[PDB]
């Protein structure tokens, strides 16, 4: 009857889900050092103006 | 009280032992003091703060010329609001305090 | 939802015909408004059909229409039906009056006209809420918020005041309670203003402008600002034509593109957005200061400073005056930021100082001063400028990593200072500490940013410099971890001095595979790094491949002789484990010495060399040395002070054993010199444990025992040392603890394996344990002495050491078996064995021996040898017989009690039924 | 005259830093403040030491 030993890795996946996004938000360029100038070089938007 | 063993306190210097040596890090020009990119650090934290009070109206005109009856028929009433207001829900939680 | 549109459509009554004609107050508006006056003057229409053509008028973007049509009418109505027709022409140029593409000139025009009309409406009815809103909207468009917020409230009490006098009451009216929750956020009272707007929503949710603005206003100023923007969203959504809802929309996607992305794919998705929104907004609203500061922001970003300042240059200045300053400080800011990035800091500075000029709160413009302040050598300046921002914003990370890098900066320049002083140094490392840990303590109490690996390095450093070099190996293994974590490369940098802080704390092994993967890192060519690894790797296995360590040091003195620390412990391990004659020894130091000697490392290993080898050059050079090194190298050098204390206490205690008038107050002198040299190795470092060793001694040697053992206690605390363990046993000694004197001796035993100080380290053994023999007099304490001086003995002529050693052993044995022999007489023969009392005449008749053959020799004056005489003639005749006395009662007594037992057998034989 | 001219020694010592030098050794292994014998030395020595 403690067939419910699927729902409590349902929670151990879930947490380990939740440090893997985490981690990758860690770890993304636009929040390190230099890196928003980086991203903002990778965007593929083009204002026509000038001042 | 006749054991003859003299008693010499000593200080002794030890010979100088120099350790390994360290090197000194290569230059990082953007974890200085100086750098721009702790600025950039603090603005994706603090970014549009400063522009949201877009003017010195707060982006709030007040107009009476959106008051019909008033200005025309001299009718004030619509500047004392409704009264039994249904305040649908995406509106009702506008009351609440801050988090 | 209720609504509050206005009619679309008007009817005049005719006057010839009494039917009505009728004007779409949406299309029929003739494009020159006098097409209208003729109109509404034949059939003479009631003047509130002008008003309602002219508001329609204004309402549909042709406000000069309207004010002409109104001007129009005063002409045709007089005295008292002019008061509407002027509140009207009021608020109509308070309208053009928010012209925010308009001049400066013509705003105070239009505000000149407003309050002409409004002061004529007055006249004529000063009570109608119109004109009395009309006042307060004029003091807020002139900037008197406290006028304005003054005069709300005496109109909010006044008309309280005519219905409690006329017996009712009144519920909110709308617009007061706007002006006063705009003019409280004016205020910074910021949660009083949100809960007027939020009370307006309650009471007109369709009221214009939109109070879900104000609501997000404050909620975004009291840092609840995801709520701000779904009031913002929500404004949106009921209007989309409201340009300044959607201008805070796309704030708020600027604000949510960081925080709401979950990686960088979604950060450009959302960022891409926000741009791409703010190009549509802003190609129909192109005199927009919070578009123009956007596009600034976007192109700091993309590089392109130069389009930020022409912006600035070409939009911003020419409309200055009426840009909000907050807004135009946000654009010199990013003027300011642009200059900086083209390395042009006059400018920087002074754009930033223009910045702070506009809005003195601006943290980033602040920052960014007191950078220019660094970028132009101005130190001590920027720290005054990040200090005083500290004043109010302690809780920043970016601030405390700026301050704590550039006191780190300090306390590593002022290191490499001569003139600065212990306390100045310890300031300087512990100022950076305490910031560069808030730093720390900040940045991990949130989960969203990195720490910039950089502040472990130099946290390590200025640990290295509070001399606890384990902390320094705990932050630099923090910064590699969290490079791994990140998959980032290692530089050589960071394992070469992980392994430096490993070989301080022990971790030879651990030392010596971290040096070798910095060596792998690489490249064979070069030689410059490829040196000292080869002396960190031969330094870190001294003590466990020293055959390795010789011969690294041997290729690095061969090849590059200018390497001294190669140099000096080449000559260290060959000279400590006899492997160079002395002459040649004797040679290489002054080869060593003459060619480096403003070297202090060489100087410092050159005075260890004269003072070690205690024969072929004694302390006459070593005093003359040491003060050459003080009096034309460095004069605060804590090694060579301590060397000369050193030498003074020797000195010093060499004259106070003996009684020549002259020449016992030299030893009083000496002592005084020793002590102020001391002193003043503290004053240059008082963590020098050295000189407190040194005051610790002359303390024991005035017997101060007390002070002595709690100084020796504390640098035992930090010194694993021969000498302070020694020491320790000797102060022990000279306390009459000798269980805990006997306890250090063997312990000074059991480490440190030093053979040279091994016999004189038994034979005090041997002085504790017959100190604690003759006051228990106990056998086993003296034979317990009587084994360690004869073990001491031996391994003095082992050594072929010092006769006078020798001699003292001797004597000491000779002693020890005199007190047994005469401890044994004096005892109940129930305590003894009769196999102990052989013992003892054998042990006599060898102190006897050891006792003439101190008596013929010429040369022993430790006792007088008069009293020497005696107990040789004394152990010889009499003692002797006295411990065959004591040797044949005790063996009768053994009879007698094999007597004893055998009598109670036959009792107990004899008792049986 | 004094020793001889490496270049790539010199080089060498640009890129190192001293961990621990011959007086900073004297700190021991954990740094305890010695400074209050400079005023102990000097109330139970020197006075005690200059009645002579």
Not at chain 3, 384 to 412: D, H, R, V
Request: hydrophobic share 35%; proline share 3%; charged share 30%.
């Amino acid at each position: 009857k403690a067939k419910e030993i699927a729902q409590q890795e349902k929670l151990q996946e879930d947490k380990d889900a939740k440090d893997k996004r985490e981690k990758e938000l860690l770890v993304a360029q636009f929040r390190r050092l230099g890196g928003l100038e980086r991203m903002v070089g990778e965007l593929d938007i083009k204002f026509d103006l000038k001042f | 009280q006749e054991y003859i063993a003299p008693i010499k306190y000593q200080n002794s210097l030890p010979v100088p032992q120099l350790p390994p040596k360290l090197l000194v890090y290569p230059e990082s020009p953007e974890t200085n003091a100086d750098s721009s990119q702790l600025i950039n650090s603090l603005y994706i934290k603090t970014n549009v703060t400063n522009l949201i009070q877009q003017d010195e109206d707060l982006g709030m005109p007040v107009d009476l010329m959106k008051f019909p009856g008033l200005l025309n028929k001299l009718d004030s009433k619509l500047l004392y609001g409704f009264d039994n207001v249904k305040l649908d829900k995406d509106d009702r939680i506008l009351l609440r305090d801050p988090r | 939802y209720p609504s509050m549109e206005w009619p679309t459509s008007l009817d005049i009554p005719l006057k010839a015909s009494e039917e009505l004609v009728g004007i779409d107050l949406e299309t029929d508006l003739p494009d020159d408004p006098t097409d209208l006056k003729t109109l509404l003057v034949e059939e003479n229409s009631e003047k509130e059909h002008w008003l309602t053509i002219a508001l329609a008028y204004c309402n549909h973007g042709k406000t000069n229409e309207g004010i002409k049509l109104i001007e129009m009418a005063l002409d045709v109505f007089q005295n008292s039906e002019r008061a509407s027709l002027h509140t009207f022409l009021t608020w109509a140029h308070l309208n053009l009056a928010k012209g925010q593409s308009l001049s400066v000139e013509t705003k105070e025009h239009e505000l000149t006209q407003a309050e002409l009309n409004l002061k004529d409406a007055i006249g004529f009815d000063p009570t109608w809420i119109g004109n009395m809103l009309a006042t307060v909207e004029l003091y807020y468009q002139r900037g008197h918020y406290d006028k304005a917020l003054e005069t709300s409230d005496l109109f909010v009490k006044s008309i309280h005041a005519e219905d409690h006098r006329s017996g009712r009451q009144s519920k909110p009216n709308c617009l007061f309670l706007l002006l006063r929750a705009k003019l409280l956020y004016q205020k910074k009272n910021y949660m009083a203003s949100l809960k007027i707007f939020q009370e307006l929503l309650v009471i007109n949710p369709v009221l214009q402008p939109d109070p879900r603005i104000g609501i997000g206003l404050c909620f975004w100023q009291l840092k609840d600002s995801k709520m701000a923007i779904k009031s913002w969203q929500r404004a949106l959504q009921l209007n989309p034509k409201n340009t300044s809802a959607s201008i805070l929309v796309l704030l708020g996607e600027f604000r949510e593109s960081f925080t709401n992305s979950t990686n960088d794919k979604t950060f450009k998705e959302a960022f891409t957005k926000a741009l791409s929104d703010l190009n549509n907004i802003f190609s129909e609203n192109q005199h927009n200061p919070v578009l123009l500061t956007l596009l600034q922001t976007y192109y700091y970003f993309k590089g392109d400073y130069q389009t930020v300042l022409d912006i600035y240059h070409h939009r911003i200045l020419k409309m200055s005056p009426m840009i909000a300053k907050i807004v135009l400080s946000e654009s010199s800011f990013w003027c300011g930021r642009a200059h900086y990035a083209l390395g042009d800091y006059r400018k920087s500075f002074i754009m930033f100082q223009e910045s702070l000029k506009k809005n003195e709160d601006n943290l980033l413009a602040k920052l960014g001063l007191g950078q220019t302040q660094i970028k132009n050598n101005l130190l001590e300046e920027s720290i005054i400028t990040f200090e005083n921002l500290y004043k109010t914003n302690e809780s920043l990370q970016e601030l405390n990593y700026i301050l704590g890098m550039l006191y780190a900066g300090k306390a590593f320049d002022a290191k490499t200072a001569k003139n600065t002083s212990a306390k100045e140094q310890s300031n300087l490392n512990e100022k950076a500490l305490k910031y560069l840990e808030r730093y720390l303590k900040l940045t991990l109490a949130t989960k969203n940013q990195l720490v910039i690996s950089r502040a472990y390095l130099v946290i390590s450093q200025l640990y290295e410099l509070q001399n606890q070099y384990k902390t320094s190996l705990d932050y630099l293994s923090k910064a590699l971890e969290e490079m791994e974590f990140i998959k980032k490369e290692i530089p050589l940098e960071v394992l070469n001095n992980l392994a430096c802080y490993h070989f301080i704390n022990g971790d030879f092994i651990k030392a010596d595979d971290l040096f070798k993967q910095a060596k792998a890192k690489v490249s064979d060519k070069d030689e410059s790094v490829n040196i000292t690894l080869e002396y960190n790797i031969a330094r870190t296995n001294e003590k466990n491949d020293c055959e390795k360590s010789e011969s690294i040091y041997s290729q690095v003195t061969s090849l590059h002789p200018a390497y001294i620390a190669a140099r000096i412990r080449n000559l260290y391990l060959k000279f400590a484990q006899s492997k160079i004659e002395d002459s040649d020894m004797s040679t290489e130091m002054n080869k060593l010495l003459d060619l480096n000697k403003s070297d202090l490392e060489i100087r410092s290993f050159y005075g260890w060399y004269l003072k070690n080898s205690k024969e072929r050059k004694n302390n006459e050079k070593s005093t003359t040395h040491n003060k050459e090194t003080l009096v034309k190298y460095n004069s605060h050098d804590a090694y060579a002070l301590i060397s000369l204390a050193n030498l003074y206490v020797t000195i010093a205690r060499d004259g106070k054993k003996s009684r020549n008038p002259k020449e016992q107050e030299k030893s009083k002198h000496s002592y005084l010199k020793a002590i102020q040299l001391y002193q003043k190795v503290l004053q240059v470092d008082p963590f020098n444990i050295f000189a407190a060793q040194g005051l610790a001694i002359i303390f024991a040697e005035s017997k101060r025992l007390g002070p002595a053992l709690e100084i020796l206690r504390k640098v035992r605390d930090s010194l694993d040392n021969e000498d302070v363990q020694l020491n320790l046993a000797h102060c022990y000694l000279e306390m009459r603890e000798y269980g805990k004197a006997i306890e250090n001796y063997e312990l000074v035993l059991k480490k440190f394996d030093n053979e040279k100080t091994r016999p004189h380290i038994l034979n005090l053994l041997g002085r504790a344990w017959y100190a604690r023999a003759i006051k228990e007099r106990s056998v086993n304490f003296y034979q317990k002495a009587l084994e360690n001086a004869k073990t001491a003995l031996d391994l003095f002529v082992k050594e072929s050491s010092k006769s006078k050693f020798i001699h003292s052993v001797k004597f000491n044995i000779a002693l020890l078996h005199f007190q047994i022999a005469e401890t044994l007489r004096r005892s109940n023969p129930k305590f003894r064995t009769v196999q102990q009392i052989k013992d003892s005449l054998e042990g006599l008749k060898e102190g006897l021996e050891l006792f003439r053959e101190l008596n013929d020799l010429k040369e022993f004056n430790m006792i007088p040898k008069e009293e020497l005489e005696q107990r040789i003639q004394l152990g010889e005749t009499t003692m002797k017989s006295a411990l065959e006395r004591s040797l044949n009662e005790q063996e009768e007594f053994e009879k007698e009690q094999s007597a004893k037992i055998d009598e109670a057998r036959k009792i107990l034989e004899e008792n049986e039924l | 005259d004094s020793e001889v001219s490496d270049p790539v020694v010199v080089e060498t010592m640009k890129h190192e830093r001293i961990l621990v030098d011959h007086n900073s050794a004297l700190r021991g292994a954990k740094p305890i403040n010695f400074g209050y014998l400079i005023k102990d030395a000097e109330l139970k020595l020197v006075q005690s030491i200059k009645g002579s």
